[PDB]
């Protein structure tokens, strides 16, 4: 299901994806929840924010779209 969310800031969308992954836990948590980015600094920022919130950051990969 192709779902599109508009935004005015990145923080509420990051909170929304946290809300989604909390309200629906994958039955195989060892699966790498892939997240696409456009650089390496952005992936670094997402990792730092996820570690800051959850107290943990593991098994998440950030590949290029190609």
């Amino acid at each position: 299901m192709l779902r599109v969310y508009h935004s005015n800031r990145l923080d509420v969308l990051e909170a929304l994806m946290e809300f989604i992954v909390e309200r629906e836990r994958l039955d195989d948590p060892f699966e790498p929840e892939m997240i696409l980015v456009q650089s390496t600094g952005m992936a670094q920022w997402l990792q730092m924010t996820l570690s800051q919130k959850f107290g943990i950051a593991a098994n998440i990969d950030f590949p290029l779209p190609a």
Binding site: L2, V4, L10, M17, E33, M34, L36, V37
Partner: protein
């Protein structure tokens, strides 16, 4: 470099050049761009290496995914894309093909809260009479639901003339095309999650003017409007959020940045 860009962006001209016929409606140099590509195709075929490439690979992938049942083998449950604002249209075609089974959530960001893109046809604007639901509560749509298309907001050939903010009107060329590509799909889900802003500081005033799709510039067409200077909003005398410092040498400017940052 040019051939790599061609492979990414134009599949149809490459399809024409594979069989060697020219493409009508283009300038010079095509008469040697095409057979060079074709000869490269036959040479890499004679080298024995695999011939699968992106321009036909996209079409084959779309065909084999659309002409399929609801159970694909070994695919992940969901995947999110965020922080991206310029993509090739073939990628969007691939993702709308993939949207039948795997759930995705495009975290696209835009400055304005309403629609400000181009328009194709008067029949096309009838398709844009849908709604955008909120997170949990209600729905929303661009203001003047009938009056925008009724009035001269959309003109017959071009996009939106009365953009409002001249900043957006000057700097949103990429954003217009991106929202035009994004607001054309049929299997899409559109719902918003926005943050309001309270205009008190100068920067917040600027951001609210950008978001609200308005204008706060007075030209003074009549002499009374030219004479008066109180129609504007007032300015705080100590609002130091936006500054404009002029220096002479780069090292002196860096020193100004240094001690200004320490003072701040």
């Amino acid at each position: 470099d040019l051939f790599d860009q061609y492979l990414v962006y134009r599949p149809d001209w490459l399809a024409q050049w594979e069989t060697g016929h020219l493409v009508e409606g283009l300038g010079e140099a095509q008469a040697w761009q095409a057979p060079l590509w074709k000869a490269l195709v036959e040479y890499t075929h004679q080298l024995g290496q695999p011939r699968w490439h992106r321009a036909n690979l996209y079409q084959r992938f779309i065909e084999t995914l659309e002409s399929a049942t609801t159970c694909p083998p070994g695919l992940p449950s969901r995947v999110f894309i965020c922080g991206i604002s310029a993509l090739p249209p073939v990628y969007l075609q691939a993702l709308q093909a993939l949207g039948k089974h795997i759930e995705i959530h495009l975290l696209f960001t835009n400055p304005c809260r309403y629609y400000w893109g181009d328009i194709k046809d008067p029949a096309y604007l009838a398709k844009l009479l849908t709604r955008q639901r909120r997170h949990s509560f209600e729905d929303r749509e661009l203001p003047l639901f009938r009056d925008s298309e009724n009035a001269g907001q959309l003109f017959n050939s071009d996009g939106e003339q009365d953009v409002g903010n001249p900043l957006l009107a000057s700097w949103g060329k990429l954003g217009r095309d991106y929202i035009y590509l994004l607001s054309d799909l049929e299997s899409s889900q559109e719902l918003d999650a926005f943050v309001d802003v309270t205009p008190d500081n100068l920067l917040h005033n600027i951001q609210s003017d950008i978001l609200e799709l308005e204008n706060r510039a007075v030209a003074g067409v009549n002499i009374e409007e030219f004479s008066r200077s109180d129609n504007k909003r007032p300015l705080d005398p100590l609002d130091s959020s936006i500054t404009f410092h002029v220096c002479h040498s780069p090292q002196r400017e860096v020193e100004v940045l240094h001690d200004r940052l320490l003072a701040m």
